[PDB]
Design a protein around this ligand. Structure first.
Ligand code: GTZ
Ligand code: GTZ
Ligand code: MG
Ligand code: MG
Ligand code: MG
Ligand code: MG
Ligand code: MG
Ligand code: NA
Ligand code: NA
Ligand code: NA
Ligand code: NA
Ligand code: NA
Lengths: 1011, 204, 193
């Protein structure tokens, strides 16, 4: 049959989909959601043998465990245990594109389990097996007899074993094929793995049972009153005495309850459903569900006899909330949302695609702790627990069908094909059927990157049709097709149009106003967080706030998909595309997260948190205005803290309780503020603190902040009585300067500061030189390949221009003596293939005070690409334990990504000054620094810097962070100016114009001295 | 042109049509039709099938068509003749002036139907004037309405020819047979003869 | 596999639907709507034998002609030939309602044909068979080997015989089932044939 190469066959003997069941035989266990003796896990120790093809399967396996088989834990991905390689491919199908066939050598997993079954289970009732997730297809045998088959790796497949099991010991046989006609719909940009990756369990249901149930909650105008409506269906023999009771609880308190016998309303000339019943319950003053306050109720559904005898009970958490689009806005409970979302794949560094509760909880808390209120399931139904969690912690969820055919040419090749309508429809209908009762799910998604075909319009309609409570969206075909209720583009820019043919990505502000358009616009993917990225994140947030119909978006994405690899010392290292011998592959492109695979945050995470704040602030006079962006709660777990400092030295500070209504404002008047004892800039910092712990946070959690410069007092005080005089020692080779226990040596041929001494100690491992390039960030690189270059990528424009090869030619080097100073003047050129790229003109002024004043004037030819940076750099001889500075921090920050950093005085261990991205690049910079401290050294001015043990060269020469080696000394990069980093997308130049170094003339000045 | 889909005998009518598990089968009946017949100028309207209630499968199929072939309106009578799966109010046997307010799926006077609150679609009876035996009593009354009301755009009489079959007596004398005559049981007796013309094309 | 008791299976190996084709190899003929050498009729005299259930059919019929078979005309309805009776039922299904199952005694029509195929058809291109109307479901074999399966008694079912035929004489075998899961979709008020 090779059912695996036929899209007309998606399953065989597979039972219908339905909401999560547990078949409790006690109502109370039901209400409290405790375990049920009728739902068993068969997770754990199973037998597994690997094969290259189904045809090689010893037909003996059927009846007898094979010996070569090993014992492995399940769920699991066999790639995770070493039988074979996981593959990282983005778009390119991992198999030759020739629908519906799959390759002849098709890695086949032979799973088998010997287990015992309670005859009590068999004497009555029905016993079904449940596979939460099998990647990509499988055949099932039980005691040597064939049971059935199933596809769609991301939804539960269930079979009735009632007639195949026997009293006692039994054997399950499972043949999982890596590839099937299903893979065609599974082209997601993630690792390609296989096996029984989700739970396996057994469910015992009575013969007469509840087979499906739907919960709806409708409201009046001010949401002061609701009707809970619950539709219940059954299987088994109908009887007059059969009953259904639906009751509703707010914890221990029974809020409402209703009972009816089976028998629906007349629906057609043929009558109605004998086997269904709809109960309706009034609820007054419902406590409403939102991501702000995740209020839930408990719904219990009992199937019982008229005498009162319970048959079984099913149940679910209920959230009273309405989702609707009105007058172009997406409303929740009558209020317009502002989606602070993130896309999140199910990925575990060691477990591959197997998920666990710990991990889930860990993700959610981080999410919440970072002011995220929503998540999109990119790009398939998640493990069932995710939803229970989102329900309870409170997150708005976008549930997406497991349909992605990005590798087809053109993209809607299968989706416009009626022969693919059935397989597609099941990926959508079975999702809806299983998840429809969860209140965290507020929007359905038809899938991802499948173009737009007629199959989508049909499926868009079935949904609206079956569940009118939630909008439907889909981004393929242009992001605004007839198959989406929301304009949901991916990577559309804030002000910048990107008019691609057929599917242009307009500027979001402009997209809203296109002639005739009236929908809301929430991006399904934005701010690609690859590597050192998130540049311009604030520009999105500003627009979202300014434009009502701009409703937020989902950043791409939560976590890096790097897997763990161990070296010969059995030391772990984070791996990506190709490190498994997998090819072709997409290298580092599977790493785009705000956190490392281990859940350690990347610096960008902080930027997201700040932009996504729920309180806005305004300053005026001694007046601070806090405005709440919450739509439903009052600031009942918040207090405001304020501090005033002078150049980091603390002056005053205090706290005031916050009490803001959702959408309201509060004015906090500040106390008369003492003036200060000297020059400098005062700065005001406010922060919002949550005094008490919550389900997702600890007491003292800071949820927001902001800063403002207050008054400033310029120093006018004139230095002091130069104590001594630097002496200049001119040789035909060097300009030498001496003052006390210090010496500076300037090479007359190079024109640079070759060496500096303190005591008899050399300070430099390499001369101080201007630097104009950076070890390329993911965003600078884009798609550019060494075999296929992207000449448009920043890296390429730079290389091609000779920026990384430019050479310093001295133009002039002079030394002069001043009343109390020694002054060296230099002029340098940086050429390439006969053109002058840049011209650097400096002055070095050494005074009796022993400070070296540096003045830099650079010229950059108009026709050369704008440089990564404009600064100086040197390898210090020294290595010290700490870095202290006064400026923006504490974390890494760049020009287009520095809103969340605060100006103050910071101090960290040298290592915190280096960001360990898997794909090494320029990293760890700090902007707006007025003073920098290291070893006995001090630099002052207005600049940006990074400091670590890695040269830019080594970084740009290295590909995995684990191959980096601490150089001798310390690398110091101090910039007058640094190029923004971009991030709108990581596949084309995305650095905004205002972050480009195109002024042509640049001027910076520094003072280096000693302590 | 009408899809080969009719599930009349289900209880309730839409049992299968509302069943996602039956969408695939249903869809091939709709998609394969359109794919074969879409270049015929004579085909002016597509129909989703007959007496199968109104299921979600209908609304999805309705959209597929509107989406692949906008050139033609799509109609369907099930579930009360004016649901969201029909561009045309296409009732079967709604009377001229008389309402027949059956529950869930009433059949309004056609004159009345057009102007129900909110309604604006044209109305063309998908079946009317059941021509069984000595029938067509009141035919003129429909015509009268058709001509006076712009939005009352006609209808398809039920139906063209009796579905009688030939059987032979002891002399080989052919006679017209109906339900039950072939020893078939259960059967609907003469209900299979409702045309304007005898099975041999001779006019009634 | 009992494909006829599963709405999940409505066809096997069937070619995609399309507007009427004739593959004219002369443009002017095409213009005139004249007959095409590439579009041949199989209508006419065939071999047929009735069975009470698919389980009663002899494997031998796949390989060779049933000597009990009669020679009948195709197309046709086997009830019109008296092999069994046609049923007039309006609303009530002619079979018990227990989807997607069908009765075990399920009248089966074994049709067969020995036909010619010119080598010119086989040297190049593709040779497909087209059944405009098979009620209600069927399996097809060509020269003893299984080709595919189909449902929907009212649209054409097309299969590629390219790899099954041989120049010269060839034998088709069609096993038609009276009832199938597709019967649930065919409850029209008319004779059941
Ligand atoms: O990491 C790049 C992401 C990733 O491929 C997403 O799955 C896909 O929707 C996409 N489209 N464009 N960029 N992306
Ligand atoms: O001959 C009566 C006719 C016939 O069964 C039609 O197929 C059906 O659509 C109908 N509905 N009401 N009356 N009919
Ligand atoms: Mg298949
Ligand atoms: Mg993709
Ligand atoms: Mg408070
Ligand atoms: Mg079938
Ligand atoms: Mg009927
Ligand atoms: Na907005
Ligand atoms: Na990616
Ligand atoms: Na690098
Ligand atoms: Na009219
Ligand atoms: Na009739």
């Amino acid at each position: 049959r090779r059912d695996w190469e036929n899209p007309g066959v998606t399953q065989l003997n597979r039972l219908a989909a339905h909401p999560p069941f547990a078949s409790w035989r006690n109502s109370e266990e039901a209400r409290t959601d405790r375990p049920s003796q009728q739902l068993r896990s068969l997770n754990g120790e199973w037998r597994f043998a690997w094969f290259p093809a189904p045809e090689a399967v010893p037909e003996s396996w059927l009846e007898c465990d094979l010996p070569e088989a090993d014992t492995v834990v399940v769920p699991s991905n066999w790639q995770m245990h070493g039988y074979d390689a996981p593959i990282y491919t983005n778009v390119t199908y991992p198999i030759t594109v020739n629908p519906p066939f799959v390759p002849t050598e098709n890695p086949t997993g032979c799973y088998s389990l010997t287990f015992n079954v309670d005859e009590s289970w068999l004497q009555e009732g029905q016993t079904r097996i449940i596979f939460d997730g099998v990647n990509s297809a499988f055949h099932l045998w039980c005691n040597g007899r064939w049971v059935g088959y199933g596809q769609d790796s991301r939804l539960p497949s269930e079979f009735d074993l009632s007639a195949f099991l026997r009293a006692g010991e039994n054997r399950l046989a499972v043949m999982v094929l890596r590839w099937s006609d299903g893979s065609y719909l599974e082209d997601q940009d993630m690792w390609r793995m296989s096996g029984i990756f989700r739970d396996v369990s057994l469910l015992h249901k009575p013969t007469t049972q509840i087979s499906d149930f739907h919960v709806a909650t409708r409201f009046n105008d001010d949401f002061s009153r609701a009707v809970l409506e619950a539709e219940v269906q059954m299987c088994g023999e109908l009887r007059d005495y059969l009953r259904v009771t639906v009751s509703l609880w707010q914890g221990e308190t029974q809020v409402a309850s209703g009972t009816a016998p089976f028998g629906g309303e007349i629906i057609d000339e043929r009558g109605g459903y004998a086997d269904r019943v709809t109960l309706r319950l009034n609820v007054e003053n419902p406590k409403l569900w939102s991501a702000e306050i995740p209020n839930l109720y408990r719904a219990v559904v009992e199937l019982h006899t008229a005498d009162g005898t319970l048959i079984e009970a099913e149940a679910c958490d209920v959230g009273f909330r309405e989702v609707r689009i009105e007058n172009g806005l997406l409303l929740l409970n009558g209020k317009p949302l502002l989606i602070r979302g993130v896309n999140r794949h199910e990925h575990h560094p060691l477990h591959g695609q197997v998920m666990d509760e710990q991990t889930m909880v860990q993700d959610i808390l981080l999410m919440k702790q970072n002011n995220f209120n929503a998540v999109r399931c990119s790009h398939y139904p998640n493990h069932p627990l995710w939803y229970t969690l989102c329900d309870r912690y409170g997150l708005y969820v976008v549930d997406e069908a497991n349909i992605e055919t990005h590798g087809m040419v053109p993209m809607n090749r299968l989706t416009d094909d009626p022969r693919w309508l059935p397989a597609m429809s099941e990926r959508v209908t079975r999702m809806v059927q299983r998840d429809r009762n969860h209140p965290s799910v507020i929007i359905w998604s038809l899938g991802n990157e499948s173009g737009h075909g007629a199959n989508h319009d049909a499926l868009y309609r079935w949904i609206k049709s079956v569940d009118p409570s939630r909008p439907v969206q889909y981004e393929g075909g242009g992001a605004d097709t007839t198959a989406t209720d929301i304009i949901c583009p991916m990577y559309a820019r804030v002000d910048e149009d990107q008019p691609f043919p057929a599917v242009p990505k307009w500027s979001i502000k402009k997209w809203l106003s296109l002639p005739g358009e009236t929908r809301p616009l929430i991006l399904c993917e934005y701010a690609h967080a690859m590597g050192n990225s998130l540049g311009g994140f604030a520009k999105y947030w500003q627009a979202f706030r300014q434009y009502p119909r701009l409703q937020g978006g989902f950043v791409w994405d939560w976590v890096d998909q790097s897997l763990i690899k161990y070296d010969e010392n059995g030391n772990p290292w984070s791996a990506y595309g190709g490190d498994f011998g997998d090819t072709p592959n997409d290298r580092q492109f599977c790493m785009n997260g705000l956190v490392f695979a281990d859940r350690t945050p990347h610096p960008a995470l902080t930027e997201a948190k700040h932009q996504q704040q729920f309180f806005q602030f305004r300053l005026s006079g001694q007046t601070i205005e806090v405005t709440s962006e919450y739509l439903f709660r009052h600031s009942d777990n918040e207090l405001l803290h304020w501090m005033v400092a002078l150049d980091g030295k603390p002056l005053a500070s205090g706290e005031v309780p916050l009490d803001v209504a959702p959408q309201g404002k509060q004015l906090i008047e500040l106390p008369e503020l003492p003036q200060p004892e000297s020059a400098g800039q005062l700065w005001l910092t406010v922060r919002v603190v949550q005094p008490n712990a919550t389900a997702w946070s600890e007491a003292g959690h800071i949820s927001a902040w902001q800063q403002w410069r207050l008054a400033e007092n310029l120093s006018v005080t004139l230095p002091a009585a130069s104590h001594a005089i630097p002496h200049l020692t001119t040789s035909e080779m060097d300009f030498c300067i001496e003052l006390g226990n210090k010496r500076w040596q300037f090479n007359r041929q190079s024109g640079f500061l070759s060496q500096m001494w303190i005591g008899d100690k050399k300070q430099l491992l390499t001369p101080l030189r201007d630097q104009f390039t950076r070890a390329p960030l993911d965003n600078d690189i884009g798609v550019s390949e060494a075999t296929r270059i992207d000449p448009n990528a920043w890296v390429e424009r730079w290389k091609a221009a000779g920026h990384y090869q430019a050479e310093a030619a001295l133009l002039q080097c002079t030394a002069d003596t001043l009343a109390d100073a020694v002054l060296i003047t230099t002029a340098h050129a940086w050429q390439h293939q006969g053109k002058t790229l840049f011209i650097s003109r400096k002055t070095y002024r050494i005074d009796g005070s022993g400070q070296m004043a540096i003045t830099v004037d650079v010229e950059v030819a108009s026709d050369t690409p704008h440089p990564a940076r404009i600064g100086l750099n040197c390898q210090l001889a020294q290595v010290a334990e700490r870095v202290n500075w006064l400026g923006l921090g504490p974390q890494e920050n760049y020009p287009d990504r520095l809103t969340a950093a605060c100006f103050d005085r910071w101090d960290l261990p040298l290592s915190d000054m280096y960001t360990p991205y898997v794909f090494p690049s320029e990293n760890g910079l700090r902007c707006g620094t007025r003073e920098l401290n290291y070893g006995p050294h001090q630099w002052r001015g207005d600049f940006q810097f990074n400091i670590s043990r890695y040269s830019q060269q080594q970084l740009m020469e290295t590909s995995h962070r684990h191959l980096l080696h601490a150089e001798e000394g310390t690398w110091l990069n101090i910039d007058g100016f640094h190029m923004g980093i971009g991030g709108d997308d990581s596949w084309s130049p995305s650095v905004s114009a205002e972050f480009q170094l195109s002024a042509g003339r640049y001027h910076y000045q520094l003072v280096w001295c000693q302590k």
